[PDB]
Design a protein around this ligand. Sequence first.
Ligand SMILES: Nc1ncnc2c1ncn2[C@@H]1O[C@H](COP(=O)(O)OP(=O)(O)OP(=O)(O)O)[C@@H](O)[C@H]1O
Ligand SMILES: Nc1ncnc2c1ncn2[C@@H]1O[C@H](COP(=O)(O)OP(=O)(O)OP(=O)(O)O)[C@@H](O)[C@H]1O
Ligand SMILES: NC(=O)[C@@H](N)Cc1c[nH]c2ccccc12
Ligand SMILES: NC(=O)[C@@H](N)Cc1c[nH]c2ccccc12
Ligand SMILES: [Mg+2]
Ligand SMILES: [Mg+2]
Ligand code: NA
Ligand code: NA
Lengths: 328, 328
Amino acid sequence: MKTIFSGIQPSGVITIGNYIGALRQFVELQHEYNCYFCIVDQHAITVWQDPHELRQNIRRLAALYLAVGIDPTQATLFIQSEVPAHAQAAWMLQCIVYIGELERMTQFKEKSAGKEAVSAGLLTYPPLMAADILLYNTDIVPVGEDQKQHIELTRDLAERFNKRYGELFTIPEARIPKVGARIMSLVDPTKKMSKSDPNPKAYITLLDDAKTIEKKIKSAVTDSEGTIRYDKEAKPGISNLLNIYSTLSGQSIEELERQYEGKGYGVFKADLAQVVIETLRPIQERYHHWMESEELDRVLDEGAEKANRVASEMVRKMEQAMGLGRRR
Amino acid sequence: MKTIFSGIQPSGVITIGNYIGALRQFVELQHEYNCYFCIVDQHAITVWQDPHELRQNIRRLAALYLAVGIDPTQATLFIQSEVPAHAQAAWMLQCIVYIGELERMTQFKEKSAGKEAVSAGLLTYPPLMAADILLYNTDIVPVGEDQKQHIELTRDLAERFNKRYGELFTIPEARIPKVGARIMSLVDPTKKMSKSDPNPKAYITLLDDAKTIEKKIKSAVTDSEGTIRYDKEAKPGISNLLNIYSTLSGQSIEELERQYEGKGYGVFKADLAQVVIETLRPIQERYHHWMESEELDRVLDEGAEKANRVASEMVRKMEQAMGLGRRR
Ligand SMILES: Nc1ncnc2c1ncn2[C@@H]1O[C@H](COP(=O)(O)OP(=O)(O)OP(=O)(O)O)[C@@H](O)[C@H]1O
Ligand SMILES: Nc1ncnc2c1ncn2[C@@H]1O[C@H](COP(=O)(O)OP(=O)(O)OP(=O)(O)O)[C@@H](O)[C@H]1O
Ligand SMILES: NC(=O)[C@@H](N)Cc1c[nH]c2ccccc12
Ligand SMILES: NC(=O)[C@@H](N)Cc1c[nH]c2ccccc12
Ligand SMILES: [Mg+2]
Ligand SMILES: [Mg+2]
Ligand code: NA
Ligand code: NA
């Protein structure tokens, strides 16, 4: 069967945006493909992370992967840094990527937008991501519409290495959901929801309690119209809320528009909070079970062992094509 | 005792400039310090290298290290890529270095001077070099005057990591010879001799045969004065040749100025070629012995084993201070 790879950074607690855009689909995909799902801690430090907070966020992300239903016997779950090959292939790939290609990435221009001094990791993020994917001969990369351009560069890099040194890498293809590929911030409907947004009101984490989910949905930005109808350009806040309600409930935007005829932002909002709470409930319960067992560590040990087996062999192949080291 | 680290890229065959500025001193230093001498193949690919040529240049550099007298029982000789920790600590360090710091490196501005599209590795060279050094708790770094600024940045990075995360790294100090820290190109006395200069006349490799050394010294650029006297500003070509003659023969510039009174660039040049030939003779003989034995591979295996032991433990410490991975 075909291979899948996808990573999420332990730069905070994952949000409903991360769930709807990616994680949710991992759960379905694990049965039809050979999957590698990564906790990308080396990507997380491209910006400051308190060390104690990072260690803790890494463990929570693993518990959340498993809590949503990723079966460790059907997929490989591992931590990026526990597989040295990622850093090794990242260096090889950054020797083939052009500076201009890196400088043109929208994520870089964005995240580096308005900053005086920025880490080089911010700029060199892409080649490490390309390595993450290419090491496993990945066919499909489920994301995450904001990740489209990175995957396009990954394809460019794979082809360049392939034509420069000889066919080695599989050319990966992105898989972006038709719905929910870009959930927006609750506080700024023109920006996507991000787990590292300095304003916690912008996102809902999978670990938010009921009272917190209620407040965040309550203060979500809308408009003075008072009409619950989908209009991304005119009513961006209300359209995003409609989108979340829809993908989480299984109801179409059309159906929700009708159900909410003659209402009523206050009631639409209160209902939505409960829908999100009911969704996270079973996830949170399973999360707590994982956080308190040694089983969590064993799954990660097993996953790194399998990932190291595959990646280190691709690194050997890469070194051989480039002429690094010695004949092995 | 104190620790020493120094690396040379297998981007070509090392030159008399590499020998006079660094390698020669490794031989003396190995008895008074704990030394790690590296074949930096990951630095070499920051620019294009034909894979077959790189594999071969890596083996030749190792044979040359040993041929000049590096004793594998007194020092650790290893290949950079065979120690994954270099790439791992390079990534961690590139997450703490600022882009502006990288853009201001003279080596980068130089090597990227006049190029349309340049690899990111060119720009991110410094953090990998900082990793090479810092992984071993290095006290002294013998180079190589052109490497002073890289070592100053390495100190900046060590301090930053130390104050940001906690004391871990030793602050290294450069050790640059009083004489021969910057041997110049034979063809362009205003530029240093470089093993990758597109013009082979610019440098003399340790593997050049007699006829080749004679030609290169013969066509070395001088001046129309015809006087053999040291004047770096007025007579840059003749001053560089005087410098090479001096460090290789053991005679002072003063002594050579006198010996060559009433001469005679043609004779000064012919004499110099023989002095360089006589110097390389015993080195080349030992080089051939190493190139044809399996002993060369065993020394490198042993060296990587020792280097991996030390480096991987520093990487564990680095990850722990940054919060990467899991408590180990
Ligand atoms: N608002 C969003 N809507 C749908 N998918 C998203 C959204 N934000 C991120 N994703 C997807 O989530 C995955 C993990 O991305 P990532 O770990 O960078 O999350 P993030 O919230 O954007 O974090 P950070 O703010 O630290 O960058 C990727 O597949 C990504 O495209
Ligand atoms: N002209 C020179 N004179 C004295 N030392 C030198 C000279 N060129 C390089 N070195 C020293 O040689 C060592 C190895 O450097 P390196 O491998 O980059 O050599 P290089 O000749 O400059 O190669 P390249 O042209 O590929 O960059 C360092 O210690 C460096 O400072
Ligand atoms: N969302 C992000 O910022 C991605 N860069 C996360 C990521 C890192 N490595 C990956 C490999 C495959 C898919 C996704 C990823
Ligand atoms: N000459 C050069 O271009 C150096 N960057 C070579 C080098 C790579 N790593 C090192 C570590 C210590 C000393 C020197 C080096
Ligand atoms: Mg992101
Ligand atoms: Mg150089
Ligand atoms: Na599977
Ligand atoms: Na020693």
